[PDB]
């Protein structure tokens, strides 16, 4: 349940490449989304909400209007898990849908 | 205001072009959307809810998993007003993001 | 799976008491909910919708403004299964609060 | 329309009473809600968003599972306003109905 260097070098890149970044003094990833509006931003959130419920993996996130900041870290390992990688991956399918 | 004539024949066509049929035995239009899963289905529902609530024009919709059937008629008039029209397009636009 | 009549007899009464009720041409439960406004109705849909995805069990449902008619049945067995009951239980909870 | 000294006094009370605070640093009120789960949290977020959109007054909220932080300030007039108030009150009614 803990991203080992290997895992990381294989997994991180495709997200790193899109906007995801690792944080400091905490194993977790972040990314800032900026939609056109609230309709879209909430639409996006909802879709993410559904899946997080489905997987029992929740994001630390903040929104204001059309901006949505997401932060991913798994609780047990207290760092990244495969669980962050897919949610992100997922988040991504969803985002590019709106935008 | 119970769309008149030339308008129905200005406006509707565009809607029929895209699959909007006229309802049988009611002044209404209806269309059904097929999504891949419920996740998209509901995400689509939400964007619309937000819009509906915002204009105070609420559809009649029936959902099952990944299928959403929507009916548009203005209550005030008991028929096709401009409200339906605009809602339908916003709907169309939203449809595309998921679809 | 498809409930036996012994089962139907155990789980049903409580839902029956509450307003749930068997459909005539098929093996499913029906129940029409009414709320003050859309906010509440949509708000309620959203909570079952999360739950429904959590459990991979979806309802057939219809909504107009503040009214929501929910229909449950376990497709796989082609009739009431425990899923509909579980679900139904929860739908009940959510319901009671918005009222 | 940035609330008056008289204004604040006649309004903040109740909110004040409920847990809502005024921010040092900015003309804004704040509150952190705590729920039993994400379902409720999210259901909550939803009705609110519904309203937020209705009004055209969006919140600054953060969410990490079962807790939500809300900050309200009227960008328009650089501080608290009738709006934030209103919306705030509403946030409350909705919160109550979450159990």
Short mmCIF file of C-alpha atoms in Angstrom, two decimals:
data_model
loop_
_atom_site.label_atom_id
_atom_site.label_comp_id
_atom_site.label_asym_id
_atom_site.label_seq_id
_atom_site.Cartn_x
_atom_site.Cartn_y
_atom_site.Cartn_z
CA UNK A 1 0.00 0.00 0.00
CA UNK A 2 2.91 2.25 -0.37
CA UNK A 3 4.29 3.64 -3.49
CA UNK A 4 7.72 2.31 -3.79
CA UNK A 5 10.14 4.22 -6.06
CA UNK A 6 9.55 1.75 -8.84
CA UNK A 7 5.83 2.11 -8.62
CA UNK A 8 6.31 5.84 -8.51
CA UNK A 9 8.51 6.09 -11.56
CA UNK A 10 6.05 4.04 -13.46
CA UNK A 11 2.89 5.61 -12.15
CA UNK A 12 3.62 9.22 -11.38
CA UNK A 13 4.74 10.37 -14.83
CA UNK A 14 1.47 10.34 -16.75
CA UNK A 15 -0.14 12.45 -14.01
CA UNK A 16 2.93 14.55 -13.31
CA UNK A 17 2.71 15.25 -17.05
CA UNK A 18 -0.83 16.61 -16.78
CA UNK A 19 -0.46 18.84 -13.71
CA UNK A 20 -0.17 16.55 -10.79
CA UNK A 21 2.51 17.33 -8.32
CA UNK A 22 3.94 15.83 -5.20
CA UNK A 23 3.80 17.82 -2.02
CA UNK A 24 6.48 18.66 0.60
CA UNK A 25 6.48 17.04 4.07
CA UNK A 26 3.65 14.80 3.03
CA UNK A 27 3.36 11.98 0.48
CA UNK A 28 0.50 13.11 -1.61
CA UNK A 29 -0.42 14.60 -4.89
CA UNK A 30 -2.14 17.80 -5.85
CA UNK A 31 -3.57 19.48 -8.84
CA UNK A 32 -5.63 22.59 -9.56
CA UNK A 33 -8.60 22.49 -11.85
CA UNK A 34 -10.17 25.56 -13.31
CA UNK A 35 -13.41 25.23 -15.22
CA UNK A 36 -15.44 27.81 -16.79
CA UNK A 37 -18.06 27.82 -14.18
CA UNK A 38 -19.83 26.32 -11.20
CA UNK A 39 -22.15 24.28 -13.26
CA UNK A 40 -19.23 22.46 -14.65
CA UNK A 41 -17.13 22.51 -11.59
CA UNK A 42 -19.90 20.97 -9.46
CA UNK A 43 -20.81 18.58 -12.23
CA UNK A 44 -17.23 17.49 -12.15
CA UNK A 45 -17.27 17.20 -8.37
CA UNK A 46 -20.35 15.14 -8.32
CA UNK A 47 -18.99 12.64 -10.75
CA UNK A 48 -15.89 12.43 -8.59
CA UNK A 49 -18.04 12.19 -5.45
CA UNK A 50 -19.89 9.13 -6.92
CA UNK A 51 -16.62 7.26 -7.60
CA UNK A 52 -14.96 8.14 -4.34
CA UNK A 53 -17.97 6.77 -2.61
CA UNK A 54 -17.78 3.77 -4.80
CA UNK A 55 -14.10 3.13 -3.95
CA UNK A 56 -14.22 4.46 -0.45
CA UNK A 57 -11.37 6.81 -1.30
CA UNK A 58 -11.99 10.49 -0.62
CA UNK A 59 -10.27 13.62 -1.74
CA UNK A 60 -9.26 16.61 0.25
CA UNK A 61 -10.59 19.30 -1.87
CA UNK A 62 -11.57 22.95 -1.97
CA UNK A 63 -13.74 24.87 -4.36
CA UNK A 64 -14.70 28.38 -5.11
CA UNK A 65 -16.86 28.95 -7.99
CA UNK A 66 -15.04 27.50 -11.01
CA UNK A 67 -11.81 26.47 -9.38
CA UNK A 68 -11.28 23.15 -7.66
CA UNK A 69 -8.18 22.14 -5.85
CA UNK A 70 -7.66 18.40 -5.24
CA UNK A 71 -5.16 16.73 -2.94
CA UNK A 72 -4.63 12.91 -2.85
CA UNK A 73 -3.11 10.81 -0.11
CA UNK A 74 -4.07 7.42 1.31
CA UNK A 75 -4.69 7.39 5.09
CA UNK A 76 -3.22 4.18 6.26
CA UNK A 77 0.10 4.14 4.41
CA UNK A 78 0.06 7.86 5.15
CA UNK A 79 1.28 8.53 1.65
CA UNK A 80 0.33 7.57 -1.84
CA UNK A 81 -1.33 4.22 -2.69
CA UNK A 82 -2.50 2.66 -5.97
CA UNK A 83 -5.69 4.12 -4.74
CA UNK A 84 -4.48 7.69 -5.43
CA UNK A 85 -3.24 6.81 -8.88
CA UNK A 86 -6.65 5.70 -10.14
CA UNK A 87 -8.73 8.25 -8.50
CA UNK A 88 -6.45 10.73 -10.18
CA UNK A 89 -6.63 8.85 -13.37
CA UNK A 90 -10.31 8.89 -13.01
CA UNK A 91 -10.42 12.47 -12.05
CA UNK A 92 -8.72 13.02 -15.24
CA UNK A 93 -11.18 11.28 -17.48
CA UNK A 94 -13.83 13.34 -15.94
CA UNK A 95 -12.09 16.70 -16.18
CA UNK A 96 -11.21 16.57 -19.87
CA UNK A 97 -14.88 15.85 -20.36
CA UNK A 98 -15.94 19.32 -19.13
CA UNK A 99 -13.05 21.51 -20.13
CA UNK B 1 -45.87 31.74 -24.14
CA UNK B 2 -47.25 28.66 -25.86
CA UNK B 3 -44.93 28.99 -28.71
CA UNK B 4 -46.94 30.11 -31.63
CA UNK B 5 -46.34 29.12 -35.22
CA UNK B 6 -43.28 30.26 -37.20
CA UNK B 7 -41.33 29.83 -33.97
CA UNK B 8 -42.28 26.24 -33.49
CA UNK B 9 -41.11 26.08 -37.16
CA UNK B 10 -37.94 28.05 -36.44
CA UNK B 11 -37.00 26.48 -33.14
CA UNK B 12 -38.34 22.97 -33.07
CA UNK B 13 -36.70 21.83 -36.26
CA UNK B 14 -33.31 22.40 -34.68
CA UNK B 15 -34.42 20.23 -31.83
CA UNK B 16 -35.87 17.55 -34.03
CA UNK B 17 -32.63 17.65 -36.02
CA UNK B 18 -30.93 16.52 -32.87
CA UNK B 19 -33.43 13.83 -31.77
CA UNK B 20 -36.01 15.85 -29.96
CA UNK B 21 -39.30 14.35 -30.63
CA UNK B 22 -42.68 15.79 -29.96
CA UNK B 23 -44.70 14.03 -27.36
CA UNK B 24 -47.91 12.25 -28.29
CA UNK B 25 -51.04 13.71 -26.71
CA UNK B 26 -49.37 16.65 -24.99
CA UNK B 27 -47.74 19.90 -25.97
CA UNK B 28 -44.27 18.75 -25.09
CA UNK B 29 -41.00 17.52 -26.46
CA UNK B 30 -39.05 14.69 -25.18
CA UNK B 31 -35.80 12.96 -25.70
CA UNK B 32 -33.90 10.15 -24.15
CA UNK B 33 -30.20 10.04 -23.51
CA UNK B 34 -28.12 6.95 -23.16
CA UNK B 35 -24.89 7.18 -21.22
CA UNK B 36 -22.24 4.55 -20.57
CA UNK B 37 -22.91 4.28 -16.88
CA UNK B 38 -24.83 5.74 -14.08
CA UNK B 39 -21.85 7.83 -13.10
CA UNK B 40 -22.19 9.86 -16.31
CA UNK B 41 -25.95 9.60 -16.17
CA UNK B 42 -26.21 11.33 -12.77
CA UNK B 43 -23.38 13.76 -13.44
CA UNK B 44 -25.46 14.84 -16.32
CA UNK B 45 -28.52 15.06 -14.08
CA UNK B 46 -26.77 17.36 -11.61
CA UNK B 47 -25.60 19.94 -14.24
CA UNK B 48 -29.14 20.11 -15.36
CA UNK B 49 -30.59 20.28 -11.89
CA UNK B 50 -28.36 23.35 -11.30
CA UNK B 51 -29.55 24.87 -14.36
CA UNK B 52 -33.16 24.01 -13.81
CA UNK B 53 -33.17 25.44 -10.34
CA UNK B 54 -31.53 28.51 -11.68
CA UNK B 55 -34.28 29.28 -14.21
CA UNK B 56 -37.10 27.70 -12.31
CA UNK B 57 -37.89 25.31 -15.17
CA UNK B 58 -37.85 21.69 -14.02
CA UNK B 59 -37.97 18.74 -16.28
CA UNK B 60 -39.83 15.64 -16.09
CA UNK B 61 -37.26 12.97 -16.17
CA UNK B 62 -37.07 9.35 -15.64
CA UNK B 63 -33.80 7.56 -15.04
CA UNK B 64 -32.62 4.01 -14.98
CA UNK B 65 -29.01 3.29 -14.51
CA UNK B 66 -27.43 4.94 -17.55
CA UNK B 67 -30.59 6.09 -19.33
CA UNK B 68 -32.23 9.42 -18.92
CA UNK B 69 -35.49 10.34 -20.43
CA UNK B 70 -36.44 13.94 -20.39
CA UNK B 71 -39.75 15.67 -21.10
CA UNK B 72 -40.12 19.42 -21.49
CA UNK B 73 -43.36 21.38 -21.19
CA UNK B 74 -44.12 24.66 -19.46
CA UNK B 75 -46.68 24.31 -16.64
CA UNK B 76 -47.82 27.84 -16.59
CA UNK B 77 -49.04 27.32 -20.20
CA UNK B 78 -49.55 23.61 -20.20
CA UNK B 79 -47.32 23.53 -23.35
CA UNK B 80 -44.21 24.56 -25.25
CA UNK B 81 -42.97 27.94 -24.11
CA UNK B 82 -39.52 29.31 -24.73
CA UNK B 83 -38.39 27.88 -21.39
CA UNK B 84 -38.52 24.40 -22.74
CA UNK B 85 -36.54 25.57 -25.64
CA UNK B 86 -33.69 27.06 -23.80
CA UNK B 87 -33.65 24.21 -21.31
CA UNK B 88 -33.41 21.70 -24.06
CA UNK B 89 -30.36 23.36 -25.54
CA UNK B 90 -28.58 23.72 -22.38
CA UNK B 91 -29.35 20.13 -22.07
CA UNK B 92 -28.00 19.38 -25.52
CA UNK B 93 -24.73 21.11 -24.69
CA UNK B 94 -24.41 19.23 -21.46
CA UNK B 95 -25.19 15.94 -23.25
CA UNK B 96 -22.19 16.39 -25.39
CA UNK B 97 -19.69 16.82 -22.58
CA UNK B 98 -20.54 13.21 -21.30
CA UNK B 99 -21.79 11.64 -24.57
CA UNK C 1 -32.02 -14.29 -4.24
CA UNK C 2 -35.51 -13.74 -5.50
CA UNK C 3 -37.17 -13.55 -2.11
CA UNK C 4 -39.19 -16.57 -1.06
CA UNK C 5 -42.64 -16.00 0.22
CA UNK C 6 -41.26 -16.67 3.72
CA UNK C 7 -38.80 -13.92 3.09
CA UNK C 8 -41.31 -11.63 1.45
CA UNK C 9 -43.21 -12.06 4.61
CA UNK C 10 -40.32 -11.19 6.86
CA UNK C 11 -38.84 -8.14 5.18
CA UNK C 12 -41.91 -6.65 3.58
CA UNK C 13 -44.26 -5.51 6.37
CA UNK C 14 -42.09 -2.63 7.64
CA UNK C 15 -41.72 -1.17 4.11
CA UNK C 16 -45.35 -1.93 3.54
CA UNK C 17 -46.28 -0.01 6.69
CA UNK C 18 -44.21 2.97 5.56
CA UNK C 19 -45.85 3.32 2.12
CA UNK C 20 -43.97 0.79 -0.02
CA UNK C 21 -46.21 -1.40 -2.11
CA UNK C 22 -45.93 -4.26 -4.75
CA UNK C 23 -46.52 -3.52 -8.44
CA UNK C 24 -49.29 -5.36 -10.19
CA UNK C 25 -47.84 -6.40 -13.39
CA UNK C 26 -44.46 -7.31 -11.85
CA UNK C 27 -42.27 -8.19 -8.88
CA UNK C 28 -41.10 -4.86 -7.58
CA UNK C 29 -41.79 -2.22 -5.02
CA UNK C 30 -43.09 1.24 -5.66
CA UNK C 31 -43.21 4.32 -3.61
CA UNK C 32 -43.91 7.87 -4.33
CA UNK C 33 -42.15 10.60 -2.30
CA UNK C 34 -43.16 14.11 -1.97
CA UNK C 35 -41.13 17.06 -0.73
CA UNK C 36 -41.48 20.78 -0.39
CA UNK C 37 -39.37 21.73 -3.38
CA UNK C 38 -36.81 20.62 -5.88
CA UNK C 39 -33.80 21.36 -3.74
CA UNK C 40 -34.90 18.78 -1.27
CA UNK C 41 -35.97 16.29 -3.88
CA UNK C 42 -32.73 16.60 -5.85
CA UNK C 43 -30.84 16.69 -2.57
CA UNK C 44 -32.48 13.33 -1.65
CA UNK C 45 -31.71 11.80 -5.08
CA UNK C 46 -28.13 12.66 -4.72
CA UNK C 47 -27.84 10.77 -1.45
CA UNK C 48 -29.45 7.62 -2.72
CA UNK C 49 -27.49 7.95 -5.93
CA UNK C 50 -24.21 7.68 -3.92
CA UNK C 51 -25.53 4.81 -2.01
CA UNK C 52 -26.92 3.18 -5.11
CA UNK C 53 -23.44 3.36 -6.65
CA UNK C 54 -21.84 2.32 -3.47
CA UNK C 55 -23.90 -0.90 -3.63
CA UNK C 56 -24.11 -1.24 -7.30
CA UNK C 57 -27.88 -1.32 -6.97
CA UNK C 58 -29.89 1.28 -9.00
CA UNK C 59 -33.50 2.36 -8.94
CA UNK C 60 -35.96 3.20 -11.55
CA UNK C 61 -37.07 6.60 -10.72
CA UNK C 62 -38.99 9.47 -11.92
CA UNK C 63 -38.94 13.11 -10.88
CA UNK C 64 -40.98 16.20 -11.44
CA UNK C 65 -40.24 19.13 -9.29
CA UNK C 66 -40.75 18.04 -5.68
CA UNK C 67 -42.15 14.56 -6.44
CA UNK C 68 -40.01 11.46 -6.86
CA UNK C 69 -41.38 8.02 -7.65
CA UNK C 70 -38.97 5.20 -6.94
CA UNK C 71 -39.26 1.65 -8.22
CA UNK C 72 -37.21 -1.25 -6.97
CA UNK C 73 -36.65 -4.72 -8.21
CA UNK C 74 -33.73 -6.99 -8.67
CA UNK C 75 -33.18 -7.31 -12.31
CA UNK C 76 -30.67 -10.12 -12.27
CA UNK C 77 -33.33 -12.41 -10.66
CA UNK C 78 -36.07 -10.55 -12.32
CA UNK C 79 -37.73 -9.60 -8.97
CA UNK C 80 -37.39 -8.48 -5.39
CA UNK C 81 -34.02 -9.50 -4.03
CA UNK C 82 -32.42 -8.40 -0.74
CA UNK C 83 -30.82 -5.44 -2.64
CA UNK C 84 -34.12 -3.71 -3.12
CA UNK C 85 -34.92 -4.19 0.56
CA UNK C 86 -31.51 -2.82 1.71
CA UNK C 87 -31.77 0.00 -0.63
CA UNK C 88 -35.31 0.66 0.24
CA UNK C 89 -34.31 0.79 3.94
CA UNK C 90 -31.80 3.53 3.26
CA UNK C 91 -34.02 5.48 0.88
CA UNK C 92 -36.30 5.55 3.87
CA UNK C 93 -33.70 7.07 6.13
CA UNK C 94 -32.66 9.79 3.74
CA UNK C 95 -36.40 10.51 3.21
CA UNK C 96 -37.38 11.05 6.80
CA UNK C 97 -34.77 13.78 7.32
CA UNK C 98 -35.78 15.99 4.37
CA UNK C 99 -39.27 15.85 5.63
CA UNK D 1 -23.80 46.97 -0.14
CA UNK D 2 -21.25 45.91 2.49
CA UNK D 3 -23.25 45.48 5.71
CA UNK D 4 -23.42 48.29 8.27
CA UNK D 5 -22.36 48.32 11.94
CA UNK D 6 -26.05 48.36 12.77
CA UNK D 7 -26.65 45.76 10.13
CA UNK D 8 -24.04 43.28 11.44
CA UNK D 9 -25.33 43.54 14.97
CA UNK D 10 -28.93 42.73 14.11
CA UNK D 11 -27.91 39.73 11.95
CA UNK D 12 -24.78 38.09 13.14
CA UNK D 13 -26.40 37.18 16.43
CA UNK D 14 -28.13 33.95 15.36
CA UNK D 15 -25.32 32.88 13.16
CA UNK D 16 -23.03 33.93 15.87
CA UNK D 17 -25.03 31.79 18.18
CA UNK D 18 -24.76 28.74 15.83
CA UNK D 19 -20.98 28.66 15.44
CA UNK D 20 -20.43 31.08 12.65
CA UNK D 21 -17.44 33.38 13.09
CA UNK D 22 -16.08 36.60 11.74
CA UNK D 23 -12.65 36.47 10.27
CA UNK D 24 -9.74 38.57 11.38
CA UNK D 25 -8.05 39.67 8.24
CA UNK D 26 -11.10 39.79 6.06
CA UNK D 27 -14.74 40.78 5.97
CA UNK D 28 -15.99 37.17 6.05
CA UNK D 29 -17.84 34.65 8.20
CA UNK D 30 -16.80 31.10 8.69
CA UNK D 31 -17.92 27.73 9.90
CA UNK D 32 -16.93 24.23 9.90
CA UNK D 33 -19.49 21.50 9.63
CA UNK D 34 -19.06 17.99 10.74
CA UNK D 35 -21.20 15.03 9.59
CA UNK D 36 -21.39 11.29 10.22
CA UNK D 37 -20.25 10.45 6.69
CA UNK D 38 -19.43 11.69 3.25
CA UNK D 39 -22.86 10.92 2.00
CA UNK D 40 -24.40 13.37 4.30
CA UNK D 41 -21.59 15.80 3.71
CA UNK D 42 -22.01 15.52 0.07
CA UNK D 43 -25.80 15.61 0.19
CA UNK D 44 -25.34 18.78 2.11
CA UNK D 45 -22.97 20.26 -0.40
CA UNK D 46 -25.50 19.58 -3.05
CA UNK D 47 -28.58 21.39 -1.70
CA UNK D 48 -26.35 24.23 -0.96
CA UNK D 49 -24.77 24.33 -4.37
CA UNK D 50 -28.30 24.24 -5.71
CA UNK D 51 -29.08 27.34 -3.82
CA UNK D 52 -25.70 28.95 -4.40
CA UNK D 53 -26.36 28.73 -8.06
CA UNK D 54 -29.89 29.89 -7.67
CA UNK D 55 -28.65 33.11 -6.06
CA UNK D 56 -25.38 33.53 -7.85
CA UNK D 57 -23.46 33.59 -4.61
CA UNK D 58 -20.89 30.88 -4.22
CA UNK D 59 -19.12 29.54 -1.21
CA UNK D 60 -15.57 28.88 -0.43
CA UNK D 61 -15.78 25.41 1.07
CA UNK D 62 -13.22 22.77 1.69
CA UNK D 63 -14.02 19.13 2.06
CA UNK D 64 -12.22 16.26 3.40
CA UNK D 65 -14.72 13.41 3.87
CA UNK D 66 -17.23 14.08 6.62
CA UNK D 67 -16.37 17.72 7.42
CA UNK D 68 -16.92 20.89 5.45
CA UNK D 69 -15.55 24.36 6.06
CA UNK D 70 -17.53 27.25 4.71
CA UNK D 71 -16.33 30.82 4.17
CA UNK D 72 -18.64 33.54 2.96
CA UNK D 73 -17.78 37.02 1.73
CA UNK D 74 -19.37 39.01 -1.10
CA UNK D 75 -16.54 39.53 -3.57
CA UNK D 76 -18.71 42.29 -5.21
CA UNK D 77 -18.63 44.71 -2.15
CA UNK D 78 -15.41 43.35 -0.56
CA UNK D 79 -16.98 42.06 2.71
CA UNK D 80 -20.01 40.52 4.38
CA UNK D 81 -23.46 41.23 2.98
CA UNK D 82 -27.16 40.45 3.26
CA UNK D 83 -26.45 37.65 0.81
CA UNK D 84 -23.78 35.84 2.79
CA UNK D 85 -26.14 36.17 5.64
CA UNK D 86 -29.12 34.73 3.79
CA UNK D 87 -27.17 31.98 2.24
CA UNK D 88 -25.65 31.37 5.55
CA UNK D 89 -28.92 30.96 7.25
CA UNK D 90 -29.91 28.52 4.60
CA UNK D 91 -26.71 26.52 5.07
CA UNK D 92 -28.04 26.04 8.59
CA UNK D 93 -31.48 24.63 7.77
CA UNK D 94 -29.94 22.18 5.47
CA UNK D 95 -27.33 21.18 8.04
CA UNK D 96 -30.01 20.42 10.62
CA UNK D 97 -31.69 17.94 8.30
CA UNK D 98 -28.45 15.91 8.34
CA UNK D 99 -28.46 12.95 10.60
#
